[PDB]
């Protein structure tokens with residue numbers, strides 16, 4: 001699995017709603033091209049992807 | 050003799066007088082409150 005050397009989450013225009021109303025961008029500098037599972041570790045916010 | 054000068058050259062707020070319906074055109078004097086009901090088709094979601 002590719003290793004994320006550093007990651008930064010910046011989130012703008014969040015709306016708490018039934019629909020996916022929030023959007024966050026992760027900036028990353030990993031070492032190898034590949035697929036990562038993205039997850040939200042809270043019971044209050046759920047990721048679409 | 051003593052008509053003075055017409056309202057085309059005397060009227061305040063710099064607006065010009067016409068005579069076919071007798072209207073004062075382009076008077077810049079006050080503030081207009083305005084309310085717009087923009088349709089939802091114009092709005093796009095924050096994702097896009």
Ligand SMILES: *[C@@H]1O[C@H](CO)[C@@H](O)[C@H](O)[C@H]1NC(C)=O
Pocket residue numbers: 050051
């Ligand atoms: C007509 O009006 C003018 C404009 O003031 C005035 O000076 C003049 O005496 C009047 N009479 C004639 C005959 O021009």
